[PDB]
Amino acid sequence: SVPAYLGDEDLTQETRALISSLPKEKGWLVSEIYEFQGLWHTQAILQGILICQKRFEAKDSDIILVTNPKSGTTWLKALVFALLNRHKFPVSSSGNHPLLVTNPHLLVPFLEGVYYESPDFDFSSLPSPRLMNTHISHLSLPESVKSSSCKIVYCCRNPKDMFVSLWHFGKKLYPIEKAVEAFCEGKFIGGPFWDHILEYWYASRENPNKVLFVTYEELKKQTEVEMKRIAEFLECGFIEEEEVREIVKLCSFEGWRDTLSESLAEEIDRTIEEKFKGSGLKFS
C-alpha cells in the first residue's frame, strides 16, 4: 500500500516520500494511520501538520486553542472568541456579533485543516489577536509558536470521551471492543492519548505563562470561574463578573457513560491510571 493522492499536487510531491517512509497501521476511521513525531495520524491531518510546521508564522499576540480530534469545540471557540473580542464586537450588540453572523469554525480556524485543504492560506491576513484551533502535540507545534510569547489553552476531555468521540465519528461514516483495545495501546488515531494530554499538562506547570490547562468538565460545571481563569491567563486587566456572565449568556445558544459498557470504561480507566501515575493529573 502507498498513500492516497489528496489535495494540491505541489504539496503532495513535497510530502509523499516522507509519509511513505513512516510506520503505518490499519486505520479504523480510515485505511492507514501513520506515526509522526510520536503520534498516529490520518493522511489528511499529517499533510496539514507537515505544511503547518513549514509555513505557519506565529505572532506573540496569538491565542491557540488545543483540543482533541472529533470532540465538539463550537462552545469553547465561542466563549474564548467572545471574551477576546468583547469590545471589538460587544457581547450586547448580539445580533451583529460575529458568532451569530458567521460559524465559530470559520472565526476560529482549525490550523492543520486549513493547511491540508488550502496550503497557501495567508494567516497573516487575519486580524490580531488571532484565535485559532489545533490538535497538534505540544512537541510538534511549529517552531515559531514554541519560540513566541503567544498563549496556548489546552482543553482536556476525559480519555473515555476522547475515544467515544472518535468511535461515534467512525461508526457514522470492526467491533468497539477491539477499537478500545487499540486506543489503550496508543496505536490509534490521535494517539497515544496519554502523550497528547501529558505534554500540555507538563507545559502548563513548567511554563504557566505560555500554556493553560483547562478540563472541559470544569468548564462545563463552573463556567464563570473557569472563564475568569482563562481571562486572567490571556489578558492583563481586570474582568468583572458580569462581563463574564454576559459572555456565557451570549454563547449559551451553542457522556461516554451512555456509549461505553462498563467493562470498556474500566479498560480505559486501567490505562489512564497506569499512564497518569503520579503526574498528578487525575480524572473524574
Residue 208 sits in a domain whose CATH number is 3.40.50.300
Residue of 162, 151, 269, 148 lying closest to 212 (CA atoms): 151
DSSP state of 209: T
Q: Which residues are catalytic?
A: 135
Provide the CA 36 distance to its chain's centre, in angstroms: 17
Tell me if 283 sits within 8 A of 271, measured CB to CB.
no
Contact by Cβ (8 Å): 173, 29? yes
Confirm if 134 and 110 have CB atoms less than 8 A apart: yes
Report which of 127, 76, 78, 130 is spatially closest to residue 99, judged by C-alpha positions.
78
d(CA 36, CA 40): 6
Neighbours of 69 (CB within 10 A): 18
Method used to solve the structure: X-ray
Residue among 256, 283, 247, 284 nearest 77 (CA): 247
Is the CB of residue 45 less than 8 Å from the CB of residue 15? Answer: no
Q: Which domain holds residue 279?
A: 1-284
| Cβ atoms 38, 30 nearer than 8 A | no
What gap in Å lies between CA 217 and CA 155, rounded to an integer? 10
Contact assessment for residue 69 and residue 190, using Cβ atoms and an 8 Å cutoff = yes
Task: Give the residues across from 213 on adjacent strands.
Answer: 154
Binding residues for 3'-phosphoadenylyl sulfate: 70-75, 157, 165, 216
Closest to 256 in 3D by CA, of 156, 162, 135, 155: 162
Give the torsion sign (CA, 108, 109, 110, 112).
negative
Q: Which three cell numbers stand for residue 262?
A: 462498563
- Number of folded domains in the chain? 1
Record the resolution, in angstroms. 1.9
